[PDB]
């Protein structure tokens, strides 16, 4: 609609994690509504491949234009300056307007007993270091006011944890914890989590294989709408954390239920 | 977008406080969309003004039509039966698909020292007992599916109480209660809740209007009060994501930060 | 220090017959306070009593009493806890107040639901919470010594089907509290969330199920076993020698909401 | 000290990981009023020899009750999991561990945001989260998995009222929480948990910071080291108790 349409034409968006799953489909919506979308992966071949699936997209406003960039974001020594660079990409000829930072990874840790520092330091620099950089970079290339946003992801598993995972399920509580810090800290800039839960990508069907259907028969047991996610379910929670320029400081769950039970 | 209009095109929708505030603005949003809007209030003259406001509405849809319907909700021997005449007529001759439940809840209501027992259910029936009322009726005319939704309303104050508010308090901690065990009892049907904080209503607004305001504008970290069309997005975004329920959505400007 | 936080304080334990209300009374009169129960059933209330005299392990000095009180009655409610209160403050004053949850039977199903059903658990739930909370400043200081603890259930963020409207007073009973710490400052304002804590009512309740009923909790839970009254009776007593922690949530629920 | 109270820790192993001083301390103190044998450990040595002093001469010290020290520097990377696990064989003794408390890094605020740098966050992140991350795999060695014994964490206030400039610590508090409810579940049937404190009053922070604190709260007071350190012995005693964030913070997040 045209008010949709006037909140998010012609704005900057960047979606770091946008060449597949919840992030890909963030960057469909975007378009749709006349944003102009820059995607950054950590893989060429599957960013141009993404790329070209924005480009033709035929829900597409004409306006809209996609760019993609490659951003590594396990390199510490240079982190800082290579989200750096992709902010600048970003801004282009003006400024960023909305961020977008998905978490579509859960490959389960080593067991407890055998985590090392070097393990534990790797999960920080991506679920947390990265994050922080990209605050601390952001006032350069985004202007803090409340009609822009910046919208991590967390995950349902940070309350409901697997066995196995304590890793990963402390740094989505830390990702949680520093959305409400950087809500103070970059203040009057949005800052907001979107916690997902079970949801059907691409790449959770090809981890599954043959064990896939078992694992959304426990997924649609574990949850009250009864069926598994669509990741375009899950993309209009960040959008809607675009159009809404009174929310701050929250953590939005769209997890199917399973959080009840 | 196409998509969007394709999710809420020919949807019924009832707005139970529809007439002013957030409720008008989530029947415009719906309205923009091709939705079938019905909006229930408790003063006809308030309705008229306001389905006519509708109506009139530059984006609607053509296709959208409005209809406006009374509904005291604390009316106590009646309360039941308005209810299902209300759910019959937003369904019309199919369905309802989405139900919102809002309110301008905001008057404070009289001192824990003295308040009395009839004071406290007038409370409890227009915050608890008429949204399980719906509820109980609902199945009748509305399917129970991960499409449809049902969006109750509770505020920031939840959360942050203001003294002499502990009464809305506790009923807003109601609401929420509610919405989980409804969550699950309904089950497929989406069930959530919307909590608003530092939203201007035409009824909210007059000389003190501005003392408050600056509480809020210095309680928040968006430094800025929020218009209803703000926290209207969030009505419609529940109904557009078939993913979630049984959570409670805060849209209060970063004041529980603080 | 630690030792006399209790010790001489006057605590009114309504609910305390059984289960989670006579095991707080229990440890209450363990650390030399002066119990008043308050109950619906006289004889029950009397058993309790005398089980509570008779306790080996309570202080000397720790006196009991009783009082019947419907919390149904809505005519007499108000003065029915006035009453109470006016009781439990003895020849002083009330120091700390523990209010145990209605742990009611499954409702009927929500298409059957009646206003008067829905009241019914107000009452219970919500109204007389408040009304303690109106009346307890003229027999209990306002401070942080003091508390006021009341009772929901971890069933309130896991909500069994069928159970909907004691799961939204389950809800209602958490926003009171929040309202009442911020009301009736200093003085502190809690709840405990207990999950399944196998009390002797309960073992009636399920009977011949109990074995499988405990296996499924024990299944749930993290703990792999199934909560004493004695241990969620320390949730309370904490609450009372804590003079810094108000308006929250104690969830001891054998970590059901970790699943 | 009840009967009922002293039976459930007389004679248990508790490590308090910063019993130095502070919150930690106060632990320290009703553990051994319960007959229960702790070991402190701190960063400092001779601020051990205050505290270990201070301790042995308690007034209402179970007179079974004994206490030690050890250090132990939750910075030192390459020294972090060796130190820590000889801290653990140390609070172990002869037999096992029953309690352990990991008391909070305190409240020093970090850098600006704007100047922050990746040294400075992986040094509060090792303190943190990767400090008590490694006590949880070294744990079962000198500890039961069984719900009658507790690994308790410390968060904060702060967690959920951030203050300007906070962002780091606020952070971690956060994955401090998160990091609970995955141990709570990778190492049950032991129970984990996290007290949040608030509103207290310590001598390495002991005016205007003091009334602050007490406006934003509802008790209207700062708290004592020793109200809160009653919340930790909770969690020791209920056996029921696990997977939570108690919330000792003077009702300030009612505001």
């Given at each position: 609609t045209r008010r949709s349409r006037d909140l998010l034409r012609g704005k900057n968006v960047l979606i770091i994690?946008?060449?597949?799953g919840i992030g890909f489909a963030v960057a469909q919506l975007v378009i749709e509504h006349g944003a102009m979308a820059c995607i950054a992966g950590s893989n060429p071949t599957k960013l141009g491949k993404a790329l070209d699936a924005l480009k033709q997209?035929?829900?597409?406003?004409?306006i809209a234009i996609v760019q993609s960039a490659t951003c590594d974001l396990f390199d510490v020594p240079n982190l800082e300056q290579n989200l750096d660079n992709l902010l600048k990409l970003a801004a282009g000829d003006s400024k960023i307007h909305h961020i977008v930072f998905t978490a579509a990874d859960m490959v389960q840790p080593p067991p407890l007993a055998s985590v090392t520092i070097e393990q534990i330091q790797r999960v920080g620099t991506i679920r947390f270091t990265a994050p922080m950089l990209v605050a601390k970079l952001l006032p350069k290339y985004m202007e803090?006011?409340?009609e822009n946003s910046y919208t991590l992801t967390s995950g349902s598993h940070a309350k409901q944890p697997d066995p196995g995972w304590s890793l990963v399920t402390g740094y989505c509580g830390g990702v949680e914890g520093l959305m409400r810090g950087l809500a103070v800290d970059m203040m009057p800039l949005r800052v907001n989590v979107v916690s997902p839960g079970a949801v059907l990508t691409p790449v959770l069907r090809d981890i599954l294989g043959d064990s896939l259907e078992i694992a959304l028969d426990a997924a649609r047991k574990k949850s009250t709408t009864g069926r598994i996610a669509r990741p375009e379910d899950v993309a209009e929670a960040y959008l809607y954390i675009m159009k809404d320029?009174?929310?701050?400081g929250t953590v939005l769950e769209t997890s199917a239920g399973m959080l009840l039970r």
């Open positions: 994690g946008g060449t597949s997209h035929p829900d597409r406003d004409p803090l006011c409340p320029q009174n929310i701050t």
